[PDB]
Amino acid sequence: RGNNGNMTFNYYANTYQNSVDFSTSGILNPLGYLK
Amino acid sequence: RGNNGNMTFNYYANTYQNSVDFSTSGILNPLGYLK
Amino acid sequence: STDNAETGVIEAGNTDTDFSGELAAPGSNHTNVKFLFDRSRLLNVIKVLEKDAVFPRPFPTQEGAQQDDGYFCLLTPRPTVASRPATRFGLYANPSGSGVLANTSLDFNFYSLACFTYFRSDLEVTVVSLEPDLEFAVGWFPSGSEYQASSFVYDQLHVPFHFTGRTPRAFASKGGKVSFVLPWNSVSSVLPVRWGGASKLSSATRGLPAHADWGTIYAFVPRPNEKKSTAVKHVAVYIRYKNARAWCPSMLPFRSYK
Amino acid sequence: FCGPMMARGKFLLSYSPPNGTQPQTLSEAMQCTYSIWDIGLNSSWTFVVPYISPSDYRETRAITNSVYSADGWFSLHKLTKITLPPDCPQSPCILFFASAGEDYTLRLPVDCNPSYVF
Amino acid sequence: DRVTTQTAGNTAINTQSSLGVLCAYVEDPTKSDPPSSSTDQPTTTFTAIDRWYTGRLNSWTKAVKTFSFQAVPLPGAFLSRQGGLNGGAFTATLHRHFLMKCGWQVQVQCNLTQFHQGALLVAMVPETTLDVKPDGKAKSLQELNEEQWVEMSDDYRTGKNMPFQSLGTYYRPPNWTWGPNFINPYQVTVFPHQILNARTSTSVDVNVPYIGETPTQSSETQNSWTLLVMVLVPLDYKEGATTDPEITFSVRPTSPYFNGLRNRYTAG
Amino acid sequence: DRVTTQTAGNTAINTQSSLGVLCAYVEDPTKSDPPSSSTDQPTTTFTAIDRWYTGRLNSWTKAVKTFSFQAVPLPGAFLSRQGGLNGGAFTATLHRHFLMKCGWQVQVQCNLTQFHQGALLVAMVPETTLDVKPDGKAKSLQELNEEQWVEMSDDYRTGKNMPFQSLGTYYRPPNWTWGPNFINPYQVTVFPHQILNARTSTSVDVNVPYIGETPTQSSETQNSWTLLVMVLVPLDYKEGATTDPEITFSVRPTSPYFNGLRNRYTAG
Amino acid sequence: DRVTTQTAGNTAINTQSSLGVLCAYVEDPTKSDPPSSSTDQPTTTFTAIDRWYTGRLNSWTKAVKTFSFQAVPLPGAFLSRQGGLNGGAFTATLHRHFLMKCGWQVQVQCNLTQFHQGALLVAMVPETTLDVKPDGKAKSLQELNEEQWVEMSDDYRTGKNMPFQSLGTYYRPPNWTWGPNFINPYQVTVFPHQILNARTSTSVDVNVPYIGETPTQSSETQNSWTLLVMVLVPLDYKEGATTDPEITFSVRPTSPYFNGLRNRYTAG
């Protein structure tokens, strides 16, 4: 979510309000493992 | 589309927000061909 | 790969044509004509009317002409001189001399990417005062129209006729801004970026189109002619091209190597 | 190639990645990405410069002349000398064109340079 | 398939070095509608104007510098009889109609052979005032014979010399610097074009439709298409070869529409 | 399961005190895609670069203070032959390609035994300029031999000594105080790391993937991973024990991608 | 089908006078197995060595007699940088491996045209010591520049001048008469070859597999294939034609197997 509360209605399209990355072709993960 | 992001709702009718031409009666095209 | 450039057609190749590789994935579309030209840029700087204007005469203008230069702005990407359409762009390199310094304008951003012969769009006009807290208003008249150059009397105050009319008038607040979009109003189908014809059959100038414009705008104070001071005030003009379309691929201006 | 039809020759067209010193030797051009072009019936050769960049995009203008803006060099070497029968004119000429590939893309419009009007 | 003989009406032109026909900017510049802006019945095509017209350009030489060019305005060359381009029934129809709409088929011939080097850029360039002097008057045939080629320089690169209205004594005369009818000489290959290289061919083919700011334009003043023949590589040869090769051109109009039938044009 | 012999190509390294392999920050730093930002075919792995490379660090002593450290830049140690780390075919491939992407497998050996106390922090630390002097030039092997260990002090805690551009005579020279390439020495255990304690083991294992600001980086300049060997507890022993134990390290690259094949690198 | 552009890796070479590719002695010299005599994993091909390498030979002249020749040993030209043939990653891999197995794709270019007569025999000849002087030492690039062409005579026809072990003072010195590395100059067309005739083509193509006395051979010493360019008909032309046409060659290795990875070769 982020620090955002006005969730009901967005005036501008997502690709104008934010960037999106282009196509090429809680419960926490541990940062380290042992073998 | 053009440089436009507020896609959800238009207040004015199309023939007032823009011109339209009157009736008379991506993948890019090549600008030249060879016969 | 082998080709013949004399064909006039050359296939756009890739890395995999001769060598080992693949296509670079697309990631942008900003070269779209409707996206590129849809941004505002400075057209011209005009003086503000405080009285009923006398519209500038057609060329060649002779000595002693009583007229108000510098108040009217053609809505053209094309070059202008003295609020009338021009072929060559002109500028002044030196202050010294005698005579009137004519106003000239260009959209440098347009010709930096036209790159085409014909253009048509709607035109968002935005008017910004260069003087702080100015109360001003914008008058527009379309292509083929003209300025109504007279005044009428109310309570012994001369009220010019350009305060009214059937064409749009937009009153800004004190320190406010004016913004509105204009349709393609010409008798012509499109605007010629470059032109080879002639408008008249006699004494016309080759390459000067008559109606390659979205009309003319002017700035005026919403006060009668009796209220005047000597201090001249200035107004900047911004234009934005809406739903831009282009035809007939052509050249970009020469870049000097000096 | 705009020379006469009777002319025969070979050229080596080489694209070099960025380096501490620009390559000048034909042996150094041979170690880079290169193609040999033969003079013959077809007069033209289309050389596609490969996109080899550390980042996904590259800068159009080399302000600081970094690796993100200057992508090496293209060079032309003669492989063999051009051979002519007698009464041919000396020094033929190679006409150069630049063009965008089918994968070419542009981003982030900026202010123009108005230097052309002055 | 380098041998092509193209037939139109009673005229057939032949080449044995055909590079193909450059069809820009539609798949067929003959496919086209009655012009929607005039309501009188148009004068359409017939078999005595469905034909080719041939004219002569000035000789190409060693002394012709890079990017020097010849300008052939269309239909202005028919109106001016530039290079002997008499148009017969087509010019007779041009002088008697107010409006004219057509495309163009052009072929330029230059008689090269082996032991010669050089390249000619042959383009249909919209839109030009290159046939007009900087004083605003069109070039006469004597002046076109005296050039003998237009030299590229600072003017014609920036548009500084294009025809203009003088401001008069009321205004300061401005320093004219730039104009939109420039030629950027490195960029002329954007237009519908072929290259007449001495190596590969003696003739080139370009096929263009009607274009304009209006769906039809005035017969007397339009210059919507211009045949531009520009040197890319200068001529060189050893002595004993053919000096001064000639340049000819063949012009055919496609799908003509004539409107506003009236008497023969007399200037004011 | 303390006895592990790990095999790669023609090289096999053995330990009898294995603490396991620290896999951060993915479950397998060998699982990885062709780099999406270059369209030429990458030079992928082969069995003569699918192997381990071994180098020597400086001796650990009683006089080495707390948090004194040695910095091994990767792949910079191969380029500089730091500690005798000749890379053979891998370095030959590095000097002939503009781009390089790989992860790293590292193992550091130090020959402790009983009757010795001390602890060594062995971490792969992104991203460091610790191999570079404060004047902006990289350390030579003579200078790395003369240190013999880098002392922690006010500089290297605050980043005050990191390489910089001088402002010049136009500006007042500012008081340099802080920089983002600091070492906070108490916090180095956030990185993928193991501790070479004298009590429990003689060798440690850390396994890291490729990371970067771009999906591939330049072969000559990147320092995206650095093997940091830092003292936590100083060496102490009674006389008669082995003076000056040696520190060796073994480095293996994982899933290398090479792009931009060109001649051998020559500096300007 | 005389226009062929053959692509390998990042390098593409073009010809407009292709006679086809001579595939001897199998239908495809790229179809081949891992070498059965070494059990380590071979270093196989990758896209920065899957490419062409180009070098220069000495100029062909009127004064070059019949059957005079130039010898290009493979891979020896890469090791010696003969004719500017820098091999980059391929030579870097050669110097770091004990064994090498590959075939070869070769193309030789010479810029003839009309008004010239002469013929060049271009053959891949197994197996030669033609790059070696009769004293047993290999030719330097200065000596290869001074020849400028090797003259056929009594030696090189009978094998009398091939490298040999001297018997010493104990034995009578024998009259050396014959050797099996002779060139029979009329019989060089038995080898995989094409003829670079001035009449018909400017370039020739020969494609050969790996051969040897063993299923792999030492990288430093093997000369299993040699590019031989030999004059069949001398150059003749009238004055005013292009003097001294140049001879270039392009070499590509096919299916390389490298064995015995070790440090860079240093001679004793």
PDB file of C-alpha atoms in Angstrom, chain E residues 1-168:
ATOM      1  CA  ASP E   1      13.612  -7.906 -64.691  1.00  0.00           C
ATOM      2  CA  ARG E   2      15.721  -4.884 -65.632  1.00  0.00           C
ATOM      3  CA  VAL E   3      14.054  -4.547 -69.059  1.00  0.00           C
ATOM      4  CA  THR E   4      10.755  -2.668 -68.668  1.00  0.00           C
ATOM      5  CA  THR E   5       8.690  -0.890 -71.320  1.00  0.00           C
ATOM      6  CA  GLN E   6       5.920   1.164 -69.683  1.00  0.00           C
ATOM      7  CA  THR E   7       2.968   2.097 -71.905  1.00  0.00           C
ATOM      8  CA  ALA E   8       0.688   5.131 -71.539  1.00  0.00           C
ATOM      9  CA  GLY E   9      -1.618   6.178 -74.371  1.00  0.00           C
ATOM     10  CA  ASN E  10       0.294   6.631 -77.634  1.00  0.00           C
ATOM     11  CA  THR E  11       3.691   6.969 -75.892  1.00  0.00           C
ATOM     12  CA  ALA E  12       5.932   4.145 -74.671  1.00  0.00           C
ATOM     13  CA  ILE E  13       9.276   4.705 -72.934  1.00  0.00           C
ATOM     14  CA  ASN E  14      11.854   1.942 -72.532  1.00  0.00           C
ATOM     15  CA  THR E  15      14.783   1.187 -70.238  1.00  0.00           C
ATOM     16  CA  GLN E  16      17.100  -1.809 -69.890  1.00  0.00           C
ATOM     17  CA  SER E  17      18.418  -0.911 -66.404  1.00  0.00           C
ATOM     18  CA  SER E  18      15.184  -0.621 -64.389  1.00  0.00           C
ATOM     19  CA  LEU E  19      15.574  -0.446 -60.601  1.00  0.00           C
ATOM     20  CA  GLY E  20      11.798  -0.596 -60.103  1.00  0.00           C
ATOM     21  CA  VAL E  21       9.190   2.091 -59.514  1.00  0.00           C
ATOM     22  CA  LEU E  22       9.229   3.940 -56.196  1.00  0.00           C
ATOM     23  CA  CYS E  23       5.587   4.031 -55.042  1.00  0.00           C
ATOM     24  CA  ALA E  24       5.305   6.631 -52.257  1.00  0.00           C
ATOM     25  CA  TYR E  25       3.293   7.331 -50.231  1.00  0.00           C
ATOM     26  CA  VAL E  26       0.487   4.928 -51.174  1.00  0.00           C
ATOM     27  CA  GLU E  27       0.615   1.466 -52.779  1.00  0.00           C
ATOM     28  CA  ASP E  28      -0.863   3.093 -55.948  1.00  0.00           C
ATOM     29  CA  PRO E  29      -0.813   6.860 -56.586  1.00  0.00           C
ATOM     30  CA  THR E  30      -3.474   6.317 -59.290  1.00  0.00           C
ATOM     31  CA  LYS E  31      -6.140   5.204 -56.773  1.00  0.00           C
ATOM     32  CA  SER E  32      -8.028   8.461 -56.010  1.00  0.00           C
ATOM     33  CA  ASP E  33     -11.614  10.105 -55.571  1.00  0.00           C
ATOM     34  CA  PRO E  34     -13.328  13.066 -57.218  1.00  0.00           C
ATOM     35  CA  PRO E  35     -12.230  16.180 -55.309  1.00  0.00           C
ATOM     36  CA  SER E  36     -14.846  16.816 -52.662  1.00  0.00           C
ATOM     37  CA  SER E  37     -14.515  20.618 -52.529  1.00  0.00           C
ATOM     38  CA  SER E  38     -15.956  21.392 -55.987  1.00  0.00           C
ATOM     39  CA  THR E  39     -19.486  20.448 -57.047  1.00  0.00           C
ATOM     40  CA  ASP E  40     -19.291  21.017 -60.807  1.00  0.00           C
ATOM     41  CA  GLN E  41     -18.560  17.948 -62.895  1.00  0.00           C
ATOM     42  CA  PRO E  42     -14.773  17.528 -63.184  1.00  0.00           C
ATOM     43  CA  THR E  43     -13.013  17.155 -66.509  1.00  0.00           C
ATOM     44  CA  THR E  44     -11.488  13.700 -66.111  1.00  0.00           C
ATOM     45  CA  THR E  45      -8.771  11.897 -68.062  1.00  0.00           C
ATOM     46  CA  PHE E  46      -8.784  10.951 -71.743  1.00  0.00           C
ATOM     47  CA  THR E  47      -6.331   9.119 -73.934  1.00  0.00           C
ATOM     48  CA  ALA E  48      -4.530  12.144 -75.454  1.00  0.00           C
ATOM     49  CA  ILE E  49      -3.524  13.460 -72.001  1.00  0.00           C
ATOM     50  CA  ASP E  50      -2.943   9.900 -70.673  1.00  0.00           C
ATOM     51  CA  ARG E  51       0.619  10.042 -72.032  1.00  0.00           C
ATOM     52  CA  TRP E  52       4.246  10.924 -71.275  1.00  0.00           C
ATOM     53  CA  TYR E  53       6.003  14.260 -71.883  1.00  0.00           C
ATOM     54  CA  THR E  54       9.776  14.541 -72.351  1.00  0.00           C
ATOM     55  CA  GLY E  55      12.138  17.443 -71.631  1.00  0.00           C
ATOM     56  CA  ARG E  56      15.851  18.235 -71.483  1.00  0.00           C
ATOM     57  CA  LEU E  57      18.004  19.354 -68.558  1.00  0.00           C
ATOM     58  CA  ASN E  58      21.448  20.957 -68.667  1.00  0.00           C
ATOM     59  CA  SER E  59      24.589  18.870 -69.136  1.00  0.00           C
ATOM     60  CA  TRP E  60      26.381  17.312 -66.159  1.00  0.00           C
ATOM     61  CA  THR E  61      30.111  18.080 -66.078  1.00  0.00           C
ATOM     62  CA  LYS E  62      33.288  17.627 -64.043  1.00  0.00           C
ATOM     63  CA  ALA E  63      33.022  21.245 -62.873  1.00  0.00           C
ATOM     64  CA  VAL E  64      29.605  20.709 -61.241  1.00  0.00           C
ATOM     65  CA  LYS E  65      30.227  20.783 -57.488  1.00  0.00           C
ATOM     66  CA  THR E  66      28.683  18.536 -54.837  1.00  0.00           C
ATOM     67  CA  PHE E  67      24.968  19.207 -54.077  1.00  0.00           C
ATOM     68  CA  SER E  68      24.528  21.433 -57.125  1.00  0.00           C
ATOM     69  CA  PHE E  69      21.030  20.889 -58.435  1.00  0.00           C
ATOM     70  CA  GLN E  70      18.405  21.525 -61.100  1.00  0.00           C
ATOM     71  CA  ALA E  71      14.797  22.290 -60.137  1.00  0.00           C
ATOM     72  CA  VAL E  72      11.852  21.227 -62.307  1.00  0.00           C
ATOM     73  CA  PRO E  73       8.538  22.529 -60.917  1.00  0.00           C
ATOM     74  CA  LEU E  74       5.378  20.585 -61.739  1.00  0.00           C
ATOM     75  CA  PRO E  75       3.092  21.663 -63.372  1.00  0.00           C
ATOM     76  CA  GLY E  76       5.162  24.864 -63.685  1.00  0.00           C
ATOM     77  CA  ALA E  77       7.537  23.370 -66.267  1.00  0.00           C
ATOM     78  CA  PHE E  78       4.555  22.800 -68.568  1.00  0.00           C
ATOM     79  CA  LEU E  79       3.389  26.402 -68.076  1.00  0.00           C
ATOM     80  CA  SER E  80       6.884  27.796 -68.725  1.00  0.00           C
ATOM     81  CA  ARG E  81       7.920  25.215 -71.405  1.00  0.00           C
ATOM     82  CA  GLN E  82      11.058  24.576 -69.350  1.00  0.00           C
ATOM     83  CA  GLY E  83      13.535  22.414 -71.236  1.00  0.00           C
ATOM     84  CA  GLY E  84      11.281  22.149 -74.274  1.00  0.00           C
ATOM     85  CA  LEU E  85       8.559  20.425 -72.239  1.00  0.00           C
ATOM     86  CA  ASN E  86       5.613  21.251 -74.488  1.00  0.00           C
ATOM     87  CA  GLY E  87       2.531  19.665 -72.948  1.00  0.00           C
ATOM     88  CA  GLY E  88       0.061  19.891 -75.860  1.00  0.00           C
ATOM     89  CA  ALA E  89      -3.489  19.008 -74.837  1.00  0.00           C
ATOM     90  CA  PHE E  90      -2.483  18.816 -71.156  1.00  0.00           C
ATOM     91  CA  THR E  91      -1.127  22.388 -71.108  1.00  0.00           C
ATOM     92  CA  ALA E  92      -4.135  23.512 -73.189  1.00  0.00           C
ATOM     93  CA  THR E  93      -6.363  22.022 -70.481  1.00  0.00           C
ATOM     94  CA  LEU E  94      -4.247  23.627 -67.724  1.00  0.00           C
ATOM     95  CA  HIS E  95      -4.638  27.145 -69.135  1.00  0.00           C
ATOM     96  CA  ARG E  96      -8.442  26.736 -69.413  1.00  0.00           C
ATOM     97  CA  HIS E  97      -9.225  25.447 -65.889  1.00  0.00           C
ATOM     98  CA  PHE E  98      -9.007  27.250 -62.554  1.00  0.00           C
ATOM     99  CA  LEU E  99      -8.328  24.140 -60.415  1.00  0.00           C
ATOM    100  CA  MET E 100      -6.032  21.178 -61.089  1.00  0.00           C
ATOM    101  CA  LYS E 101      -5.451  17.939 -59.145  1.00  0.00           C
ATOM    102  CA  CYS E 102      -3.107  15.156 -60.287  1.00  0.00           C
ATOM    103  CA  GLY E 103      -0.212  12.945 -59.285  1.00  0.00           C
ATOM    104  CA  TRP E 104       2.954  12.423 -61.311  1.00  0.00           C
ATOM    105  CA  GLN E 105       5.000   9.642 -62.901  1.00  0.00           C
ATOM    106  CA  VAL E 106       8.570  10.778 -63.605  1.00  0.00           C
ATOM    107  CA  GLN E 107      11.562   9.079 -65.217  1.00  0.00           C
ATOM    108  CA  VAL E 108      14.958  10.780 -65.593  1.00  0.00           C
ATOM    109  CA  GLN E 109      17.476   9.432 -68.120  1.00  0.00           C
ATOM    110  CA  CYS E 110      21.219  10.096 -68.160  1.00  0.00           C
ATOM    111  CA  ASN E 111      23.507   8.301 -70.613  1.00  0.00           C
ATOM    112  CA  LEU E 112      26.307   6.934 -68.474  1.00  0.00           C
ATOM    113  CA  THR E 113      28.405   3.843 -69.175  1.00  0.00           C
ATOM    114  CA  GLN E 114      31.505   2.149 -67.763  1.00  0.00           C
ATOM    115  CA  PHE E 115      34.771   4.055 -67.066  1.00  0.00           C
ATOM    116  CA  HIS E 116      32.705   6.854 -65.432  1.00  0.00           C
ATOM    117  CA  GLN E 117      32.080   7.544 -61.743  1.00  0.00           C
ATOM    118  CA  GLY E 118      29.485   9.766 -60.101  1.00  0.00           C
ATOM    119  CA  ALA E 119      26.025   9.718 -58.561  1.00  0.00           C
ATOM    120  CA  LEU E 120      22.880  11.797 -59.093  1.00  0.00           C
ATOM    121  CA  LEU E 121      20.113  12.133 -56.502  1.00  0.00           C
ATOM    122  CA  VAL E 122      16.723  12.309 -58.264  1.00  0.00           C
ATOM    123  CA  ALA E 123      13.923  13.245 -55.839  1.00  0.00           C
ATOM    124  CA  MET E 124      10.370  14.585 -55.951  1.00  0.00           C
ATOM    125  CA  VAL E 125      10.532  17.248 -53.234  1.00  0.00           C
ATOM    126  CA  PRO E 126       7.431  18.868 -51.669  1.00  0.00           C
ATOM    127  CA  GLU E 127       7.251  21.802 -51.518  1.00  0.00           C
ATOM    128  CA  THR E 128       9.729  24.170 -53.158  1.00  0.00           C
ATOM    129  CA  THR E 129      10.163  27.756 -54.279  1.00  0.00           C
ATOM    130  CA  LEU E 130      13.498  26.749 -55.861  1.00  0.00           C
ATOM    131  CA  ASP E 131      12.311  27.816 -59.335  1.00  0.00           C
ATOM    132  CA  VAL E 132      11.961  31.421 -58.087  1.00  0.00           C
ATOM    133  CA  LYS E 133      14.747  33.996 -57.737  1.00  0.00           C
ATOM    134  CA  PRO E 134      15.244  35.709 -54.333  1.00  0.00           C
ATOM    135  CA  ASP E 135      13.624  38.903 -55.674  1.00  0.00           C
ATOM    136  CA  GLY E 136      10.330  36.977 -55.937  1.00  0.00           C
ATOM    137  CA  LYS E 137      10.170  36.583 -59.723  1.00  0.00           C
ATOM    138  CA  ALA E 138      10.364  33.210 -61.460  1.00  0.00           C
ATOM    139  CA  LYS E 139      13.474  32.249 -63.411  1.00  0.00           C
ATOM    140  CA  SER E 140      13.434  32.724 -67.171  1.00  0.00           C
ATOM    141  CA  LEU E 141      14.832  30.106 -69.544  1.00  0.00           C
ATOM    142  CA  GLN E 142      17.775  32.387 -70.381  1.00  0.00           C
ATOM    143  CA  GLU E 143      18.643  32.571 -66.675  1.00  0.00           C
ATOM    144  CA  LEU E 144      18.202  28.800 -66.312  1.00  0.00           C
ATOM    145  CA  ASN E 145      20.586  28.405 -69.262  1.00  0.00           C
ATOM    146  CA  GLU E 146      23.161  30.790 -67.735  1.00  0.00           C
ATOM    147  CA  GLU E 147      23.563  29.109 -64.316  1.00  0.00           C
ATOM    148  CA  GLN E 148      24.158  26.294 -65.686  1.00  0.00           C
ATOM    149  CA  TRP E 149      23.721  24.607 -62.289  1.00  0.00           C
ATOM    150  CA  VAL E 150      22.513  26.118 -59.017  1.00  0.00           C
ATOM    151  CA  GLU E 151      25.368  26.156 -56.511  1.00  0.00           C
ATOM    152  CA  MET E 152      24.702  25.150 -52.917  1.00  0.00           C
ATOM    153  CA  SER E 153      26.038  27.726 -50.445  1.00  0.00           C
ATOM    154  CA  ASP E 154      24.942  29.500 -47.250  1.00  0.00           C
ATOM    155  CA  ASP E 155      21.776  30.600 -48.989  1.00  0.00           C
ATOM    156  CA  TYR E 156      19.561  27.587 -49.944  1.00  0.00           C
ATOM    157  CA  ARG E 157      20.857  25.802 -46.830  1.00  0.00           C
ATOM    158  CA  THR E 158      19.179  28.078 -44.281  1.00  0.00           C
ATOM    159  CA  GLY E 159      16.302  29.391 -46.389  1.00  0.00           C
ATOM    160  CA  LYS E 160      17.817  32.896 -46.222  1.00  0.00           C
ATOM    161  CA  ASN E 161      17.133  33.621 -49.920  1.00  0.00           C
ATOM    162  CA  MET E 162      13.475  32.553 -50.192  1.00  0.00           C
ATOM    163  CA  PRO E 163      10.963  35.069 -51.660  1.00  0.00           C
ATOM    164  CA  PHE E 164       9.642  37.611 -49.188  1.00  0.00           C
ATOM    165  CA  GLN E 165       7.524  40.713 -48.705  1.00  0.00           C
ATOM    166  CA  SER E 166       9.588  43.827 -48.010  1.00  0.00           C
ATOM    167  CA  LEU E 167       8.539  45.717 -44.889  1.00  0.00           C
ATOM    168  CA  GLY E 168       8.884  49.221 -46.338  1.00  0.00           C
TER     169      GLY E 168
END
